[PDB]
Amino acid sequence: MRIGHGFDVHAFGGEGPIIIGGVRIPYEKGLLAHSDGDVALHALTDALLGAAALGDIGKLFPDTDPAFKGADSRELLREAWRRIQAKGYTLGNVDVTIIAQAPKMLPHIPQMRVFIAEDLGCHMDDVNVKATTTEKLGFTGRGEGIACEAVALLI
Amino acid sequence: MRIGHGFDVHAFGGEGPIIIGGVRIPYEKGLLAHSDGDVALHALTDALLGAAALGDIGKLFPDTDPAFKGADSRELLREAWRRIQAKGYTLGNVDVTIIAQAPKMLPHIPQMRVFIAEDLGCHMDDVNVKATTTEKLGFTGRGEGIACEAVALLI
Amino acid sequence: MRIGHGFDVHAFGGEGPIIIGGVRIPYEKGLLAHSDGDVALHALTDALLGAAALGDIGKLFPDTDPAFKGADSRELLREAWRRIQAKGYTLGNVDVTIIAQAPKMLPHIPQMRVFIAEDLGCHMDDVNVKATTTEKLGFTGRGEGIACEAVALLI
Numbered sequence: 062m063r064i065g066h067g068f069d070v071h072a073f074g075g076e077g078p079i080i081i082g083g084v085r086i087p088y089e090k091g092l093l094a095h096s097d098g099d100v101a102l103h104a105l106t107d108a109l110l111g112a113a114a115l116g117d118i119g120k121l122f123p124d125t126d127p128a129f130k131g132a133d134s135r136e137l138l139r140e141a142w143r144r145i146q147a148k149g150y151t152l153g154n155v156d157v158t159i160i161a162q163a164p165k166m167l168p169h170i171p172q173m174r175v176f177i178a179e180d181l182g183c184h185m186d187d188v189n190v191k192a193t194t195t196e197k198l199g200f201t202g203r204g205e206g207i208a209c210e211a212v213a214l215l216i
Numbered sequence: 217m218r219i220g221h222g223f224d225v226h227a228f229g230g231e232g233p234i235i236i237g238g239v240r241i242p243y244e245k246g247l248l249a250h251s252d253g254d255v256a257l258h259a260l261t262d263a264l265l266g267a268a269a270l271g272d273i274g275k276l277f278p279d280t281d282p283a284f285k286g287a288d289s290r291e292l293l294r295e296a297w298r299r300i301q302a303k304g305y306t307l308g309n310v311d312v313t314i315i316a317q318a319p320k321m322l323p324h325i326p327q328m329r330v331f332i333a334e335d336l337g338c339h340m341d342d343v344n345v346k347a348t349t350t351e352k353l354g355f356t357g358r359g360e361g362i363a364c365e366a367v368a369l370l371i
Numbered sequence: 372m373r374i375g376h377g378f379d380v381h382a383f384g385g386e387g388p389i390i391i392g393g394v395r396i397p398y399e400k401g402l403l404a405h406s407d408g409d410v411a412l413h414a415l416t417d418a419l420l421g422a423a424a425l426g427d428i429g430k431l432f433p434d435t436d437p438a439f440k441g442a443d444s445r446e447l448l449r450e451a452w453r454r455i456q457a458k459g460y461t462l463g464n465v466d467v468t469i470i471a472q473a474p475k476m477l478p479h480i481p482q483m484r485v486f487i488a489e490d491l492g493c494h495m496d497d498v499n500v501k502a503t504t505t506e507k508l509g510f511t512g513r514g515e516g517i518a519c520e521a522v523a524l525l526i
């Protein structure tokens with residue numbers, strides 16, 4: 062079994078809604094990014110790639126490469142997941158922590174778990190997401206952006 | 217074995233002392249929270265619940281529910297731990313990292329390990345806490361508040 | 372198998388270059404620290420010590436003790452690693468995440484993996500490093516300093 066850690070941040074920008082863990086969540090402002098900027102998933106992806114010892118989402122799916130523009134992060138995830146399985150690993154489980162002041166991630170979480178467990182091809186019981194604010198402190202607390210951490214266990 | 221990640225933050229406020237990992241630590245300012253605002257423990261709790269795939273402390277013990285007011289976080293911990301054991305898991309080990317500029321967590325750490333290992337019902341050797349500042353950088357570095365991360369392994 | 376989490380931050384200061392994961396990386400400003408201030412490694416070290424349940428780099432190699440001045444963090448690492456092996460543990464694998472806006476960690480990463488895998492005495496396949504910025508947000512995003520997280524699995 063191997064461990065892995067991930068982390069991503071994205072600045073709010075423009076109109077909403079935002080995409081987190083696959084769910085289109087309505088919010089005043091949106092998020093700025095080359096891809097769909099789904100922080101929850103990018104975080105999960107790195108943690109997954111990290112366990113696989115394949116580096117990070119950045120070595121694999123460049124900001125520069127235009128094809129990755131508006132890119133559905135779930136695709137990136139599924140691919141990084143493919144390559145991981147090829148390296149002969151299998152999902153132990155993943156845990157994602159969304160550090161955001163807003164919007165309210167809570168109600169969307171189950172749907173996220175559905176999307177993530179699908180992409181990874183596991184049971185929801187192997188995919189856990191949770192959320193938390195930084196109590197008005199920090200860029201996250203100021204509403205400047207969303208951050209997200211994630212850890213994962215591969216076999 | 218399953219992994220889990222947690223993270224909490226609390227703004228300083230009012231008179232001290234503060235409570236971290238169960239220890240009443242003297243400090244000029246205190247911490248603002250619905251419960252006792254023990255960051256070290258909330259962080260541990262989420263990480264524990266995350267491994268159990270039970271979500272987070274928020275789905276289980278609401279800011280809104282008044283009973284959780286001034287609430288001894290160790291209780292919340294012990295309960296989240298109970299439910300976890302019921303799901304058939306057992307403590308692999310936990311690691312907590314306190315990111316605070318002040319007060320000096322160091323001298324209180326052993327007592328924390330005592331409290332945490334009790335609550336979890338393991339040996340201190342399965343509970344590790346450590347501390348670090350952000351070098352005057354950030355809300356933590358500015359003394360605006362304390363943050364704390366934690367990871368855990370369940371079986 | 373045991374888990375472990377680490378985290379460090381260092382303020383930029385003076386002339387470059389900086390040292391991360393062992394690599395001397397050229398950059399305008401440098402980093403302020405009692406030791407060489409290699410964040411990547413300190414982060415790895417704590418995570419390693421955390422899994423071993425030996426506490427943190429701070430309980431073992433003091434800012435105050437002058438010998439640790441300008442100290443090659445790899446030494447600190449190798450020692451913390453020694454003591455860990457003595458406690459009867461062996462490297463499962465480690466994952467390091469550098470949260471820095473600049474300089475570009477990417478090209479130096481392989482050399483880092485070489486240094487880290489040497490120090491730990493494992494194969495590069497057990498040492499993974501990755502990098503990420505906070506999108507101009509935060510002290511890291513403002514270029515005020517570098518932060519770094521790391522997780523580790525011991526056996």
Ligand SMILES: C[C@@](CO)(OP(=O)(O)O)[C@H](O)COP(=O)(O)OP(=O)(O)OC[C@H]1O[C@@H](n2ccc(N)nc2=O)[C@H](O)[C@@H]1O
Nearest residue numbers: 094095096119122123124129471472475476477502503504
């Ligand atoms: C998948 C993409 C493109 O579609 O998504 P978006 O960022 O557009 O949302 C990106 O490649 C996802 O980029 P991400 O890795 O999560 O955050 P970035 O700040 O863009 O990091 C880009 C790359 O630069 C490297 N890097 C990062 C920070 C730093 N100080 N030094 C570095 O060398 C890292 O190896 C990383 O892979």
Ligand SMILES: C[C@@](CO)(OP(=O)(O)O)[C@H](O)COP(=O)(O)OP(=O)(O)OC[C@H]1O[C@@H](n2ccc(N)nc2=O)[C@H](O)[C@@H]1O
Nearest residue numbers: 161162165166167192193194249250251274277278279284
């Ligand atoms: C145990 C309690 C109550 O006694 O402690 P205190 O916060 O008062 O200290 C709280 O429930 C402990 O709250 P905590 O989860 O650690 O931090 P909060 O910022 O209050 O998050 C509350 C809940 O809202 C959800 N949430 C959080 C942030 C966000 N952007 N969107 C969300 O949907 C999360 O699912 C979380 O469970």
Ligand SMILES: C[C@@](CO)(OP(=O)(O)O)[C@H](O)COP(=O)(O)OP(=O)(O)OC[C@H]1O[C@@H](n2ccc(N)nc2=O)[C@H](O)[C@@H]1O
Nearest residue numbers: 316317320321322347348349404405406429432433434439
């Ligand atoms: C290895 C050394 C010395 O050569 O490196 P440098 O910091 O000079 O680079 C230090 O001991 C590496 O210090 P580090 O632990 O990573 O960050 P620091 O902010 O200096 O934390 C110092 C110690 O104080 C304790 N501590 C920290 C923060 C806090 N709020 N309360 C505490 O009690 C921790 O137990 C930690 O071990």
